[model samples]
Target chain A: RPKYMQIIDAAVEVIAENGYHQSQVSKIAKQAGVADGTIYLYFKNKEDILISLFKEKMGQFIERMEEDIKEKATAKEKLALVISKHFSLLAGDHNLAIVTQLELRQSNLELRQKINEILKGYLNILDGILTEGIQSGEIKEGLDVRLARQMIFGTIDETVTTWVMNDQKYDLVALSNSVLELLVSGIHN
Target chain B: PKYMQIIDAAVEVIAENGYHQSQVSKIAKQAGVADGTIYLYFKNKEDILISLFKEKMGQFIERMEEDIKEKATAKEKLALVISKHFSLLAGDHNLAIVTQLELRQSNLELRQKINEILKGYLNILDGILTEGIQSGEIKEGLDVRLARQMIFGTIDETVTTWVMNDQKYDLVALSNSVLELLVSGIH
Candidate 1:
């Protein structure tokens, strides 16, 4: 179990450093402080490492957010919490942010498509909030949930990219509030 | 004369063949000049793109800045500028393709230099926002940079979305409405 977690961290660092394309087993091994032979003891291959990282980390990310939001009484608060959590996760982890937002985009078409499939589960959380709001009449029923989701994701994604491109000097959390306010205006009642 | 001709050819080549596929020889051939003639004007391919951006697009902001200087209100200038930008991109489909799609894919080094050139556009935006504050047209305590990012992000998103969607939408149709949404926060 310890060796596997080490491998995962090493893979993240390697992927973050050289991007997905250049992250090799030996590089991950070096980062993990283990032999290349040891990596195979855990992962079948590089793809296995990547798949396991997403499955493990994202699973925990969602679980933690769900637990945190359990005490929130309103859907709006929950929505804002979810948005803030998503932004803060990437905002705090520069390496993960780069790997997820920038480096991973350059992955081969097939691999990128696989990542998209993984992302859909995370993205459906937004859909669930919008659906709850609409059903409760807290938000407009006719709102295009798909487009609203894109707007929210696209806004945050583009905003983070602007921050990253600017060397991360800006206050991301402050900007997150403005973005959340704008979305609340456009979508929420 | 020949320089403008080459840049025009380069724009066409970039749009039709995509940025990576547009070779110097292709642009030269498109311009009806010898391949070596391009070197007389530009140092290399990267030089040509930078030159094309400056030579063709530099005057866009200059003219806008000059025209807006006469306007008494920042709100009017902001609306007009957004309208001009939307119309400009819509009117010039070739340049639109290069700017909206092709040129954005440049490597980080060139992308940074392009961002420097883009400061002029950003400056014009910041100027309008500052003026809005002075004239009470905009709300007090607005984060000028963040608002600019959101404004540009929204427009940029809309533009790229249109290009990615096969340009089926009427882009200019949303000009007034989008500007209004930006100014008033879509109330």
Candidate 2:
């Protein structure tokens, strides 16, 4: 498991530095300080590394976010914490930011389709949070959870993307309050 | 211009045929003109494609700017922008298919050209958001750039879903809800 993480962490750097196209398995192995065949033992190939990286990274992201916000009683508080955490977490790692925001987009449709499978599952958790808000009478009556989901996810995604596009020159976490204000204002009574 | 008709035909040709099968010869047949006519206006296939998108996008932005200038309030202006965007595609499925589905599959070079065209549209969003603050419509202080992204991304994601869903729903009807959500929130 340590070696797997070691390989994965090396991939984040190598892919970020060299781009996924240039970041071959051998290069990743060298960066991970593992033998080339050692990589094959864990990863099926180059594509597996990127897919595995996303699964592990986003999996942990949601797992931790869920854990962090579970104690918050109101959807408002949970929403606020999730937005802030999402922004702060991505902002913490520049390489992952680059890989997710910029480089991952450059891959083929097959790769993107694979990402969609993960994304559909990933975003539903946030959708669940919205559903909770609605059911509890906190969000308001007759709210379209679908459109709300789009606005919430789209706004957050767009914010991070703009930050990444700007070369991370600005503090991404600084926008946390403003974004929450905009989103929360929309849903509140 | 006869060449202008060629642009319309290009959209139709590509909308039905997609980017790959839409050759100059095929486009020429749709335009009811000789392939030589297209060549007269364009130097090559790429030129024709760029010119086609540029003409379409240029007119779209120009009209949006002019019409929004006619509106009194930022909220209404925003509504007009959303409605007009939805309607333009509503009136013309060819343009919608070209825009929502076909154009995105373009090579990097063409996509870059399209993005260059899109800046004008994004500017209109920025301009409206700026006016919202100035007119006391939106609360006084906010990030004009960041808010514009939210607006653009939300509408864009909305359209992409509609396109992907087979355009079965009334996208134009959703314009007001989209407007209300942006201006009033879900409350």
Candidate 3:
């Protein structure tokens, strides 16, 4: 199990270093310190590794994020914590940050669809937060939850990508607080 | 001086034939210089692109930064910054295409440098957001970094969409609504 886990991490590094098109199985094996054939035992092919990687890593990410938010007492605090934690999680993990932002966008349309399916849990977190906000009157009742969710996700996604492209020079976690403020209050004041 | 001519020639060639189709000799002829003259100014074709963007965008940012420095309010500063951004790109279709679409075709290494140049614009926005938050004009909890990203991303997405759609829409006029959405957060 440990050996297979090593292989997965290597795959992530290899993918992040080289765009998806150029990444090779040998490169992954070299990074993993396992023989190339050893990867075959655990993965059907590169595609399988990609799918499994999302399933395993993203599943854990969502679970931890959900658990982390449950500790907060108020819906508003929970919302802010969720945003901060999500951004910080990516910021702290460099490999995942590059893979998620740059490498993933290169996947073909079909693979992207599968990745989107794997992303439902992530999207659900946003929906859950919105639902809670609306019920508590923190958010307006008539908000188009889906479109709102898109705008929120799009905003955060774009923000992180910009940070990455900018070489991550700023305190991303500190910035998350203000991002939450804008989302919560808008610019109406 | 010769190198500058070559760089300008590259821009004209790139604008005429599209970035992918432009060649060294073509640029040379446009500048009335030999193909080898390009190497004197830059290492290769890619170098010419980086230099062109650096020259044009660097000057653009300098002028706008000076213009915005005199503005009084964070709101006005932000609004003017957004307008200047769109107008600067909108004013020159060729430069806009090169900056927006063609230049993106540069290899990853060059892209990283171009990204560095673009940060000048972001830093300006960041300063305004910081000022707004400090003055209690903007919500205190707003994530300056994330808000900047959203602002830039929304504007970028809007601009690229317009360009991709054949510039059918009035981009200059759309700045108001887009700015409103940015400030209001779609609420």
lDDT of 2 by residue, A1-189 (tens): 899999999999999887776689999999999899999999999888988898888888888888888898777778788888888888999999877765565324345557656666657876888888778888757567777777777788778876776678998898887887777664112
Clashes of each: 0, 2, 7
Alpha carbon RMSD to native, model 2: 4.8
Tens digits of per-residue lDDT for model 3, A50-167: 7777787887787888888888765568767877877878888887777777666531334545776787788788888778777777766456565456556666777787777766
- lDDT string for model 1 (B102-133, tens) is 43422567667777776788788788888787
DockQ of each: 0.15, 0.30, 0.18
In candidate 1, the residue pairs with backbone N, CA or C atoms under 3 Å apart (3 or more residues apart, or in different chains) clash, namely: none
User: Model 3 clash tally?
Assistant: 7
Q: Candidates 1 and 2: which is better by DockQ?
A: 2
Please give, as one word, the docking class of candidate 3.
Answer: incorrect
What's the fnat for candidate 1, on a 0 to 1 scale?
A: 0.12
- What TM-score does chain A reach in every model? 0.89, 0.92, 0.92
Recovered native contacts in candidate 3, as a fraction?
0.30
lDDT per residue (tens digit) for residues B48-159 in model 2: 7678777886788889989998898888888898898899887887777667544432244665677677778889988987777777777666777877877876776676
lDDT string for model 3 (B1-187, tens) is 7867776677667766555567888888989987666777789887788788888877777776888878887777877876877787787666655665543332478777787777787788788888888887876766676677777766665665455445666778767666666666633
Q: What is the DockQ of candidate 3?
A: 0.18
